[PDB]
Amino acid sequence: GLPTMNTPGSCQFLTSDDFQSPSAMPQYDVTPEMRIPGEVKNLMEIAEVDSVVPVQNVGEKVNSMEAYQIPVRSNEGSGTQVFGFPLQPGYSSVFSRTLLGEILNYYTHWSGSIKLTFMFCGSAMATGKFLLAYSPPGAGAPTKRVDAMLGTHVVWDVGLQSSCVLCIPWISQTHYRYVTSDEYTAGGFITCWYQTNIVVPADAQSSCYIMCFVSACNDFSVRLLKDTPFISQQNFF
Amino acid sequence: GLPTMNTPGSCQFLTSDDFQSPSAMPQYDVTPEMRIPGEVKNLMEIAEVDSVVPVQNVGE
Amino acid sequence: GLPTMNTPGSCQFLTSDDFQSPSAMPQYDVTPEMRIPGEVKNLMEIAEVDSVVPVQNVGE
Amino acid sequence: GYSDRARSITLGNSTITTQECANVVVGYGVWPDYLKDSEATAEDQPTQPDVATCRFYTLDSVQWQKTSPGWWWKLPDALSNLGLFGQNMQYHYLGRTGYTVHVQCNASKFHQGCLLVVCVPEAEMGCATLDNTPSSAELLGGDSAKEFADKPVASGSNKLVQRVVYNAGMGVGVGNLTIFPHQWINLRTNNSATIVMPYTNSVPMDNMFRHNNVTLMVIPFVPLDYCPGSTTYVPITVTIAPMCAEYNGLRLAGH
Amino acid sequence: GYSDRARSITLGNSTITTQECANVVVGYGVWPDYLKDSEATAEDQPTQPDVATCRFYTLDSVQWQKTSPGWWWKLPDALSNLGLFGQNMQYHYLGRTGYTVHVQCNASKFHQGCLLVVCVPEAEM
Amino acid sequence: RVADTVGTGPTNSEAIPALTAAETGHTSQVVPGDTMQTRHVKNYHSRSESTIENFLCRSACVYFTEYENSGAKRYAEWVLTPRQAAQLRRKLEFFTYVRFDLELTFVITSTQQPSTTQNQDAQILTHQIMYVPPGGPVPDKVDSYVWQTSTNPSVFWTEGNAPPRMSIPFLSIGNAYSNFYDGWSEFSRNGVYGINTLNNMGTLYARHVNAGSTGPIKSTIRIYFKPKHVKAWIPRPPRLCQYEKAKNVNFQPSGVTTTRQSITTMTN
Amino acid sequence: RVADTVGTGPTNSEAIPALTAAETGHTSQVVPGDTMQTRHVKNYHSRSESTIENFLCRSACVYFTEYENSGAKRYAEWVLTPRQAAQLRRKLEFFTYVRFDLELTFVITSTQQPSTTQNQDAQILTHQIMYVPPGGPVPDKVDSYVWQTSTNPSVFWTEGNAPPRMSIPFLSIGNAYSNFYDGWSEFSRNGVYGINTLNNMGTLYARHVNAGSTGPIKSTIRIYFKPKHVKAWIPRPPRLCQYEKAKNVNFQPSGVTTTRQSITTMTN
Amino acid sequence: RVADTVGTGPTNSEAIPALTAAETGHTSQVVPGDTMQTRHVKNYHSRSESTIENFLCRSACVYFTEYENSGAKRYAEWVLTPRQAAQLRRKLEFFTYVRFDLELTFVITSTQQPSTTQNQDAQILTHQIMYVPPGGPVPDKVDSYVWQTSTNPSVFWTEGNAPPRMSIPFLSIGNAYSNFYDGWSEFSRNGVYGINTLNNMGTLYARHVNAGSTGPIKSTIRIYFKPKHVKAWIPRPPRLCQYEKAKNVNFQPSGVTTTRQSITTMTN
Amino acid sequence: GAQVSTQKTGAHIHYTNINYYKDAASNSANRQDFTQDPGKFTEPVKDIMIKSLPAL
Amino acid sequence: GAQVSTQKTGAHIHYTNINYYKDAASNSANRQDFTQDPGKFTEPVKDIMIKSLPAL
Amino acid sequence: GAQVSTQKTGAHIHYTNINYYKDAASNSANRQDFTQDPGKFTEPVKDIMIKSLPAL
Amino acid sequence: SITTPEEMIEKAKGETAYLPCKFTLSPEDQGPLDIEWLISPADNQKVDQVIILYSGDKIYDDYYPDLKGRVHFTSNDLKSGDASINVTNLQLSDIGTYQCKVKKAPGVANKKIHLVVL
Amino acid sequence: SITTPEEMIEKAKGETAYLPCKFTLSPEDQGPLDIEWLISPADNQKVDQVIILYSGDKIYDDYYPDLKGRVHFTSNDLKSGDASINVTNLQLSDIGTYQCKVKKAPGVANKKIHLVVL
């Protein structure tokens, strides 16, 4: 008999709501929990694991294991570009399919650093030096090694240590960016050049390959849960 | 006059529910309980009693 | 199962009301507040600032 | 004054020695152990041979050619015909065990190549028919290593597993396979890869015949290459040793 | 368990990494520092950008042939057209700075050669 | 919350954090400060929305079917399985084993079909939805005796009211549901590969309690599945190719990713 | 919860637990450990759902009848008895005497009948359900004076609202209801065998308060019986053959169980 | 509350409060007592309704669109932006940057269109409103697979119920929303001037879940925006001329104010 | 006068219930009433029989 | 956890409010937040100007 | 038996929740459960690797 | 669930073709078992024509004239997963598509076999 | 958003008129890209007549006879903001109003260009 007054939003169904409902089966005993390894409590932990990135995604290479490999060789020249791609993990084709890119497609905003690990896959006798570099937005993608040096760069020397890590620092005006392509929140440009020519001895291949691994740092977050475009369905299975 | 908001599942009839309903007959005195033997409190107790099983269940 | 009685004004939409509604996006982290100058907390403060008045508002 | 890249593992009456290794990946941080009295289900006393069952079992070698797409193995199935381990499951209904996978491959400084060693639990594989499921023979190859196909398997009416290396038969990116416990062998830095895997399943113990808990896949992202006058034939040996194995449900042998 | 022949120098937003180096020669035992108030002369406050001016600037490469006689550079002049450093001096009358010279060259075990890297102050030619 | 950036100064030393080995399978975990000069920053960002409970706890339409108040088809039957809809399914397939509580919400709408019937008077339509456990009897016809629902949970809903909602506890003979099963149900391995006795919940039956009107009426029922108190184990790579059959992970080979004009290209 | 298995070792002794005598009518109660070697196990399973309150406390449809807003049949009368529906009845017959509280829920649906009537305007139909105690006056006609319900509990329900529900306290002259009565009501034993003054609750009358529309309308009322605070005494064997008459346990002789090809056969 | 008038007496002195300089840009802040004799007054008036929370926290219709249950147009899509309605927009443009929570209320009404269709029977119409985040997939057709709303918040409303209402938290990559942006999105300044990645919320999609009736029906949906917990920075002059385009502050030159017959005139 | 009780939970939390009717037969079912006493059905013998000892 | 606050009343009484959502952006407007600081808009000058003293 | 907890708020307030069912699986989702342990996925190696020290 | 539902059988003339339609039932399945063998002719004439039907624990062998007394269920249990038929006299006409339907509520399973005779 | 949507282009006869319809897409835009070039004649005959259409990543050059093989997209990317066309042979008839429509759900952008030939 308590007087009550309903408010706008009664008898409505919001998919994302948190209410209590009656149990279809009362007093039901569920199976006791068992210890299973690799328990996940947050999506970010998955996104912090290195994922192989296919930089050479061109032509029919995406249908072969050649998309992931990156070609390098001995050339009578210096300052040439090994590769180049923009900082768009959510939108760029290169990162759209990585463990990081796959997870970044269920969220709208993303803010944090990105780690790029490059592993030389040449012979023990093969030696070389590259210039990994990241260039800020508002400047045209560097076209020569002189221009690229101006921005954040790391001289990498081939050595007993197989891989060198390039850590892209978070340099943005706003606190967050957009996973979808957006001109206002431009990320930046990542390029690699030859600091020194690859040098090999006789009876040794002068053509090698490199592998790229992209993971997130300890200051990476995402927001606004949204659906992933990738998965499509016209009828039920 | 308290503001209230209904949620999905209002005015629905779930056979297996546990709610309170008004009494059709108010202030009714029921017959006092009497001691009857073999009271059951759980179905399992019945299932723990030996039952003859027809193994040779063939033909007629 | 609590007995309830609705009163005049149920399921109505008053533009100037103060009720609680469910969040469309749950557990959302908003951007931290930043110090911006000339913050306003009352309309009167704006109205206390001298404004040029066009007394000779005649013809063209 | 020990060397970081120098190791030796001793299980049962078998010892492996590597003088050029990277490290040891212990699954998801869990070390193989026996079943506790709180998480157990089968009331009968478990039987643990320990020395006979848990020991290194060396499978047949494979050749790493310049066009080799990749190879895969079913860990429970692979050791089903080898030693007491194989015999033990033949006579037991239930079985719970952990494994240590030591993939071995060596080459000269001049040789250049790269391989991926990864353990994938519950690796359900697709079929080219798109209406049927892969045959037992195609999916499981005891005393052999099932290989991957570079070009896509032809679609028709049959039971052939899609061996596509890029989807890897699970319809997922090959590059995203690093999420599972894994290690890389590059002929410029590594000469072997060692992985320790704890038993992982929804149930406490399961049948080891019709059900396979884990799957070992070796895939080369960058191919094997070398100049003329070098060694053309380069083999790969896989040694797998069960850890903390225990069985329940003694019965007449068979499957 | 670090390696004696392994090093990394971080200046500004640039990092160099060498996995086969001998050591580091710090001039005549003096480390680059700012001007003290006792040895200064210009009364006006000095301007120190620090992050922009002090950073690694990579010059054009050269080819080491079998008959290559040698090469030379003027440290103040070389960086006069590169980055803020070049711009800073264009707008300033006086300038006092120190440098770190990292010459890089790599070759296979089979290759054999030898080079001399030396900094000569006031090299009147 | 997240880690705060630490201020750093130019450093010349033997320490080489950037140089490492990816063969060890160990993530480098190198902060920005190791390779460049940074300024101390007090981050206030929090990883709240990236949690599995926040990621998977949303209502997603899994299956919609229709029935009539007359004609041959008078009732609709669907077995509980989340592989019917690609969206919710792909999110669930992210891990190998998931244990969670289930909340069911049903949206029912009735549409009048075209007919020559005249003087049509419609009475408030009442719909009955009955849940049948595995091994329980299934109704042969709309007017069958099974609809008594003595021991079967059922819900009666009248049009013009909020959608019916019930909460189901985790049901699985096994400790957790298995997204992917590698093997055969038969000990002889001569059966459909990947079939499991696990993940079997029940069957849902929906019918009209009363005809309501002389004219024909068709109603469509949509089932929504919202996971609650979810738990995840063994993360795996996300689906790369489109789902063909719910029963088997059968797929069509798909390009690893999209192509670009060439390497060194900043656009798609 | 349930008993935890106890670890055992090989034992050679005079003690013989397995050997026993079934003539004593005593259950052997031999654990697995007595006849074989077991491992200590900490069982966490609980016998919660097997309780009588959980088994019998569910709503089960016992009887549905219909009435019209015009024509001969204008009201429907049913006497309260749970033997009408085989399901709820079989569950109740598991014991000899059961004492419990009763909860009644009614689902009412109206269907428009085919007619040549034109310009049909329907007004929200209101249904009145009246409960009559044993010995109370019963209405002769729909417009009778009995429907005043001065001392008879009655409920008025308007279509488009949640179904009407009322709670009834245990009513029985005797201490408990009797499922099976062995004997005759008459001291001379010349009457229907098994008839008892016990288990008599009342009669339910349902009618339309208003005609509502010029066109004919037929409404069906379903009665649901949910036992509460149930108590059970003297367990008995479950029904083996199909129920023929509610009044008497009369049955048709039925095969003890289904047959198989032969003994030693593992399949049906 | 407000300041209380202070009693004053005739004063002859060197102090000259009225004389001052407006060039300093400093408001004189001279009370009535400085220039004339006043009496002490205890003011009880309070500046409560002039606060920004009281000024901006009211529901204002920002956009209304319609859809049909048949024909070409079957769904309606609108991108979230408050510049659609001049009223709410002008109030918001009073400051430069505003940070606030948002509350959305939708009013939906269905009107039957003229048609030659006969025997029309209508079933309670159910409307689905889906909110799509920036970069999320947009449904191509009414019966598209996107309406599954797995990760997209959506609300289902049935006619005859209180209007659906949801609360949205402040969403902006930047610290606060920007009412006026001076500049170009492109670093090369070759794009629409004033375009900003800020103030982008999402898109709203509204459709009929079921056809409901054979005859055509058209429904109009009105979106209401109520700001909550509002904050304001940098006050600016109010709009003097009528709004032409939502995208740009483009205006038509307007007379500073209305004219009068001459100066010295007390009327309009 | 609110009664706080423990909810049914798995192994290896609380709920508040109030009675708005004085009828008491108008209350909810006693679902949490688990008691076991099979001794009467299984062994209603006069002399206790020990398993170790032979029956006869 | 109920918050008791004073109702808006004339011059010359109490209300209780509870939050049923943990979202917090799901709360009601802060109507009773009256704060005045016009000093910045009216006088943003560097040197304080006393009314008694002449401006220049 | 009402549980008072902190609402999700921004940086740089409280809500009361009661359980009306003893089922417990009938409760709301545990949205506020943020725990991070990526160590197992990122570094499941046997020997701890210090960043300052060279890998091999 | 029927093992290898889509497949193709090749046999020579007069060799007796055995068509395997072995199924497996889920726990939910509790309805009456109904088997339906329908044949689609390669002639391109009316398709989905039934040949042999098994319902109500009874067998019907007269739904298609060409196959008169030639289609018999290979197994006598039939309730068991094995529900296969064998054509004794293979003929040139036999070439066509054979569909096997196992219907046990809830859930219907179908198997399609392409028959070619050399 | 199209840069300078309303504008007027003046060129002499036979000088090749280039019409600029460069656009910019908002984050919400996620639908298929559809370009539609419709011309309104100065003749005052039926207006809104399409000349060239770009949809489904394909180009159609036959919707208006007078301009036969004379309208080609200047840029080959087309997905890029630049979606411009150029008429090679300017003629006296060319005088009219040209409308450029860029449709990417949600949101439609339109540009109108007045063409005068001296």
Short mmCIF file of N, CA and C in Angstrom, two decimals, chain D residues 8 15 109 121 147 171 243 255:
data_model
loop_
_atom_site.label_atom_id
_atom_site.label_comp_id
_atom_site.label_asym_id
_atom_site.label_seq_id
_atom_site.Cartn_x
_atom_site.Cartn_y
_atom_site.Cartn_z
N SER D 8 71.25 -28.83 -19.27
CA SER D 8 71.11 -30.31 -19.28
C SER D 8 69.88 -30.71 -18.47
N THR D 15 69.21 -38.44 -20.59
CA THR D 15 69.76 -37.08 -20.34
C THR D 15 69.96 -36.37 -21.68
N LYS D 109 77.38 -21.62 -39.18
CA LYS D 109 77.26 -20.14 -39.16
C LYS D 109 76.74 -19.64 -40.51
N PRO D 121 47.12 -26.03 -26.95
CA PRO D 121 46.12 -26.94 -26.38
C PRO D 121 44.78 -26.91 -27.12
N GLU D 147 52.28 -32.87 -42.15
CA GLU D 147 52.87 -31.62 -42.71
C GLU D 147 51.77 -30.64 -43.14
N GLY D 171 41.94 -21.56 -38.79
CA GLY D 171 41.30 -20.32 -39.29
C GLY D 171 41.66 -19.11 -38.46
N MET D 243 55.64 -35.92 -17.84
CA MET D 243 56.01 -35.51 -16.46
C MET D 243 54.83 -35.73 -15.50
N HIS D 255 40.93 -50.02 -27.54
CA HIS D 255 40.44 -48.64 -27.80
C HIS D 255 39.28 -48.68 -28.80
#
